[PDB]
Amino acid sequence: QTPHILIVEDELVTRNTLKSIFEAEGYDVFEATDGAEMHQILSEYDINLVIMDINLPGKNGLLLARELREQANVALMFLTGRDNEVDKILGLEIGADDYITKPFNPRELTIRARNLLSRTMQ
Amino acid sequence: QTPHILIVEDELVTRNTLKSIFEAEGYDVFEATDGAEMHQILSEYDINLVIMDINLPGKNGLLLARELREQANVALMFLTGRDNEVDKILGLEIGADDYITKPFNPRELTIRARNLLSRTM
C-alpha cells in the first residue's frame, strides 16, 4: 500500500524539504497551508499520516490536531522549530504520536514514520 | 486488560523511578536486570510495553531489542543516560517505538506510553 502523507505547513521552504524527504521513501505527498486545505485533503484522499506544524497562521496546529482527533485516529506527528516543553506535552496529550523539533535528522523522521505506519496501516 | 510494563534496567535508582512513574498510572510493573530475566518474564507473563536500557550486564539493549524484534512486535521504548545520535537512530531503526533520554519528563513518558498503548492494545 503506497503510504500517503499530508504535510500541513505554510512555509514553502520547510514544506518542500519535508515533501522531498518523503518522496524519497516512496510516499505520495499531499500539501496543505492551513486548516481548510487540511480538511479538504482529508475528505477527498486516503491519508495515512499527518505531519503538522504547531505554529501556523489561522487556526493554530494544536487546535487543528484537536479537531483531527475528534474525527479520526490517523497517525499524527507535530513539527516545531521551537523547542518548548509545554507545546511538546500538549501536542502529545491531545494525541499526537510524535513530536519533532528543528533541526531534525531526516533519518529519524522517516524511521519514526515507518515504525508508526507499520502499526497503523492494517 | 490492565497494561503490563516490563522495565529492563540494571540501575536500581533509574529502575525505581520508572517503576514509580508507571505505578502512579495504575499499570502492573515487571522488573528485569538483563536479557535472561527479560526473556523469562516474557515467557511467564503478558507484556504490553517493554522499556529497556541500552547498556546492560551482558548483551546490550540494542541486541536484546534486535533479537526480541525477531520474535515479537510488542511496544518498545529505549532508555539512555546520554543523548547520542547514532544509538538513537539504531534503536529506532531496529524497531523501538520511542527513544528516550535523561533527564526525562515523566509526563512525556506516560503520555507517549498511553498513546502507544492505545494503538497496540
From Swiss-Prot, chain A:
Explain the post-translational modification. Phosphorylated by ArcB.
| Compartments in which it is found | Cytoplasm
Q: Which GO terms describe its cellular component?
A: cytosol; protein-DNA complex
**Main location, first listed in the record:** cytoplasm
- Top-rank taxon of the source lineage equals Bacteria
In the record, biological process GO terms are: negative regulation of DNA-templated transcription; phosphorelay signal transduction system; positive regulation of DNA-templated transcription; regulation of DNA-templated transcription
Alphabetical keyword list = Activator, Cytoplasm, DNA-binding, Phosphoprotein, Repressor, Transcription, Transcription regulation, Two-component regulatory system
TM stretches of this protein: none
Q: Name one GO molecular function term.
A: DNA-binding transcription factor activity
List residues of the Response regulatory domain: 4-117
Q: Which residues carry this modification: 4-aspartylphosphate?
A: 53
Outline what the protein does: Member of the two-component regulatory system ArcB/ArcA. Represses a wide variety of aerobic enzymes under anaerobic conditions. Controls the resistance of E.coli to dyes; required for expression of the alkaline phosphatase and sex factor F genes; it may also be involved in the osmoregulation of envelope proteins. When activated by ArcB, it negatively regulates the expression of genes of aerobic function. Activates the transcription of the plfB operon by binding to its promoter.
This protein's name = Aerobic respiration control protein ArcA
Origin organism of this chain?
Escherichia coli (strain K12)
Query: According to the entry, what is the taxonomic lineage of the organism?
Result: Bacteria, Pseudomonadati, Pseudomonadota, Gammaproteobacteria, Enterobacterales
Location of this fragment in the whole protein: 2 to 123 of 238
